[PDB]
Design an enzyme around this catalytic site. Structure first.
Site, mmCIF file in Angstrom:
data_model
loop_
_atom_site.group_PDB
_atom_site.id
_atom_site.type_symbol
_atom_site.label_atom_id
_atom_site.label_comp_id
_atom_site.label_asym_id
_atom_site.label_seq_id
_atom_site.Cartn_x
_atom_site.Cartn_y
_atom_site.Cartn_z
ATOM 1 N N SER A 1 0.828 -1.192 0.240
ATOM 2 C CA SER A 1 0.006 0.145 -0.052
ATOM 3 C C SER A 1 0.833 0.880 0.032
ATOM 4 O O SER A 1 0.913 2.026 1.122
ATOM 5 C CB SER A 1 -0.985 0.012 1.184
ATOM 6 O OG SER A 1 -2.303 -1.111 1.163
ATOM 7 N N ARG B 1 7.355 6.733 -4.676
ATOM 8 C CA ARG B 1 7.950 7.427 -3.503
ATOM 9 C C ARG B 1 7.671 6.511 -1.996
ATOM 10 O O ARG B 1 6.459 6.162 -2.065
ATOM 11 C CB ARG B 1 7.581 8.778 -3.383
ATOM 12 C CG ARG B 1 8.249 9.664 -2.210
ATOM 13 C CD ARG B 1 7.641 10.877 -2.099
ATOM 14 N NE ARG B 1 6.214 10.762 -1.613
ATOM 15 C CZ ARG B 1 4.923 11.478 -1.738
ATOM 16 N NH1 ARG B 1 5.519 12.856 -2.060
ATOM 17 N NH2 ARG B 1 3.769 11.250 -1.755
ATOM 18 N N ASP C 1 -4.122 -2.289 -0.639
ATOM 19 C CA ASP C 1 -5.057 -2.798 0.199
ATOM 20 C C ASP C 1 -6.735 -2.639 -0.103
ATOM 21 O O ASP C 1 -7.457 -3.285 0.210
ATOM 22 C CB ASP C 1 -4.860 -2.136 1.536
ATOM 23 C CG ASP C 1 -5.168 -1.048 1.961
ATOM 24 O OD1 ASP C 1 -5.141 -0.149 0.592
ATOM 25 O OD2 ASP C 1 -5.111 -0.450 3.007
#
Lengths: 477, 477
Positions: free
Chosen positions: A149, A164, A202
């Protein structure tokens, strides 16, 4: 555990007026919600266009519905900020499953370690888990769903180019690379008979796991400290994937979409932001960003109250001759504050008095406390009302008259009366002529385990495709 | 949130054996339970005899069943250790009620104050509450039920001769006197139109409130840090009240009984006490006393584990080369410990590892942790099994084949899987041929508010009797 009468008959006119001023600021009209839903769909369409939008609308590369008849053994990996879960999911082919779980703490030093350190640690946990549950080996490499996630972009499901890092991670070498092959070669070195078939978010997993048990699921939503939604769209509707899909992925194949709509209206055109929201944005780590999230996330509810009270203190309305020191520091009031205030079952509001006295050294009067309770109710109600706008946007874009929304996250699971708020809000939009929330056409149900059971079912659907020789991404990788 | 597989295939034979030794110590047989139930009834009968017994079996002076058709406004006062509740109960005469509640903190100095200080403080809270909800007065003095859960003896319901203080109270002048007239003259001085008609114990209130909403209630039980039960008996069965009851209280009038059976088997003849229980008794503030409570209360579950582990540490089985310091101090492990260990959903038992590491600085191995989980399950299971013995004793003494047991208290409300344990235990006694716990003849349901709503309904039934000219105690006061 009944609700309090909440009489206001003892509240001085000067506060009575300040309360009315706050209701003006935090109320979202039925029609005001409908205008945001209208613009929301527009921004949803834009995210799927060639041009690009503000809502990323990332394809999750799940191209089938779970039938509920899927069988077999599948592994799931959930990598959180502080620890990972390893889940063995046994699909029984009858909307049922069996889980076996381990959870391993991440050594706090691994958050600042290198590429090799992180992936080999996961590998060790994986071997250790496999040697316990398959001590004699396997007839076939176990497929594994990987819940990652994090800000990443997928050109195919068994891939995850990391944009990132987030949630305190600071590993170098990983940022800007596909993370699956990095994990895989670590799995291979320890000679583990597992195979990384899928990397998911998720919310995509919340959608897919809940659809496996509940055939009426049309959307998976997360309302916690973060905010996100995922639904199944149609390939012919995705303009930015036109001429990139292989022949076997037809125009009538469904596509799962990781919305990431927490950034809806960063342009500030529709969302009813008060001066208190504006300060929260300007003092945030990332000003100008995550506009819809700041308006809906549970992480910010306690901070809104802090600034509202602080503003009323300066105007000399409340806490006269008191020690404000602790209320001056940012984020001192978390979600637990409005949570506990709304739960207060007493008319004199003693739980609220105990909260402010013990935690903040502030002695409140009854009338001040009654204002505080009104504040928390409003703040909580606005959040829920701005949230369902996203449920309504997705349901209207796809033409869902009937829908089950799979919901998860601290705010949905624990925020007092949140389900009753959300239900009333949806009723305010569609104007349903129904007395009971149980009979509502569109309603929110408790989601199944998205990051575990969810990632496994996606591993199943992907292995189903790979074994037959079907595509799971853009042509040419 | 599924249950863990709990494999023991990696546990060294030396521990495997120590685990079996513990199962021998903490298991209560179906037949062993039946022998305690047999002796329990005997001790219940003895408590109602002229001679006297070890179970006090105090008459609560409620001589009617709530019909569910009672109407009117009634006040309830609940005096706890740290704070009081004031409850207005509106009985709607349809097994329904409406509550309005205030809660006032007791100033910590009042615990050591005098008689006048305590009662006038309650009076002030009462006036303040009444002036808010009846700002224009009342046509009739409001009847009030007073929950005073303390060692006291009643010769009539509107009386409470206090034996001894408990829960940190140390007020002089009150001990050895009737407390109702002390409260009343304080109410009268502030000219409050309320009238103290009844003083009850919270368990009697749990019985009566639950019977008002659920006609199938035959018993009220409390399983928390304290332990108690209350049921309706028949006057012809109470030998110690023979020739003391007035003419209007006939031999077929039911009598509510505050058992106070926490002292069942202080003689140590039936209860399967281990050497760990014996140490707990010998090191308690009151050795030799509250035998059944120490075996069943939730307050002692964490302490049992501590001593068991400490004993295994000395024998060199567990925590080899570890820092035991924190485990040496008494009552360091409260109910939360076995609570959290049983809740642990992971096979490697990481929540238990996090508990022992963070809170106790002890690093555990997987196998040690697996032993710890077995320990907590056993300790919790024994407690539940010894508890239902009291439910079965009361149901068999009175000939209840079908019963609803109203249950309250932290252990019933929060201890993981406690209802499933208690149900299985009752099934083990009566040997019911039923597959579902929902269809059990005798079962445990969530009680209604005993100390609030309960005290009010008792105030109703007493005012009903006093207004007509009926007796509510022994002849001649």
């Amino acid at each position: 555990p009944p609700a309090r009468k909440g009489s206001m008959a003892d509240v001085p006119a000067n506060l009575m007026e300040q309360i009315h001023g706050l209701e003006t600021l935090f109320t979202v009209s039925s029609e005001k919600m409908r205008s945001i839903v209208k613009h929301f769909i527009s921004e949803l369409d834009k995210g799927l266009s060639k041009k690009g939008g503000n809502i990323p609308m990332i394809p999750g590369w799940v191209v089938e519905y779970p039938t509920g008849k899927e069988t077999g053994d599948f592994l799931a990996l959930d990598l959180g900020g502080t620890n990972l879960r390893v889940v063995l999911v046994k699909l029984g082919g009858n909307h049922d499953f069996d889980t076996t779980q381990n959870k391993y703490r991440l050594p706090d030093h691994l958050r600042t370690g290198t590429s090799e350190q992180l992936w080999s640690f996961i590998a060790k946990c994986l071997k250790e888990f496999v040697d316990e549950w398959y001590p004699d080996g396997v007839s076939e490499p176990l497929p594994l769903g990987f819940t990652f996630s994090y800000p990443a972009s997928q050109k195919k499901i068994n891939s995850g180019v990391l944009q990132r890092w987030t949630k305190g991670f600071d590993i170098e070498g990983v940022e800007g690379h596909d993370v699956v092959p990095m994990l895989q070669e670590q799995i291979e070195k320890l000679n583990i008979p597992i195979n990384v078939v899928a990397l998911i978010n998720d919310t995509t997993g919340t959608l897919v796991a809940s659809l496996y048990t509940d055939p009426q699921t049309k959307m998976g939503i997360i309302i916690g400290t973060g905010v996100n939604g995922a639904y199944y769209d149609v390939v012919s509707g995705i303009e930015k994937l036109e001429g990139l899909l292989p022949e076997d992925i037809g125009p009538d194949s469904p596509m799962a979409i990781n919305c990431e709509y927490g950034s809806f209206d960063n342009e500030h055109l529709v969302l009813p932001r008060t001066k208190y929201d504006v300060i929260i944005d300007e003092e945030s780590p990332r000003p100008g960003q995550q506009a819809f999230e700041k308006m809906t996330s549970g992480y910010y509810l306690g901070e809104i109250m802090r600034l509202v009270l602080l503003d009323l203190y300066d105007s000399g309305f409340i806490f006269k001759d008191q020690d404000i020191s602790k209320l001056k520091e940012a984020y001192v009031m978390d979600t637990s504050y409005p949570s506990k205030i709304e739960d207060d079952p007493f008319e004199n509001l003693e739980d609220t008095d105990d909260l402010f006295k013990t935690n903040l050294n502030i002695e409140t009067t009854v009338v001040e406390r009654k204002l505080i309770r009104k504040l928390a109710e409003l703040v909580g109600t606005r959040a829920a009302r701005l949230t369902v706008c996203g449920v309504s946007a997705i349901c209207d874009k796809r033409g869902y008259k009937t829908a089950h929304i799979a919901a998860d996250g601290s705010v949905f699971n624990r925020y007092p009366g949140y389900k009753e708020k959300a239900a009333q809000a949806l009723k305010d939009i569609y104007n349903w002529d129904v007395e009971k929330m149980e009979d509502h056409p569109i309603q929110l149900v408790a989601a199944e385990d998205g990051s575990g059971v969810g990632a496994a079912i996606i591993a199943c659907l992907t292995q189903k495709r790979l074994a037959a020789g079907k595509s799971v991404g853009i042509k040419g990788e």
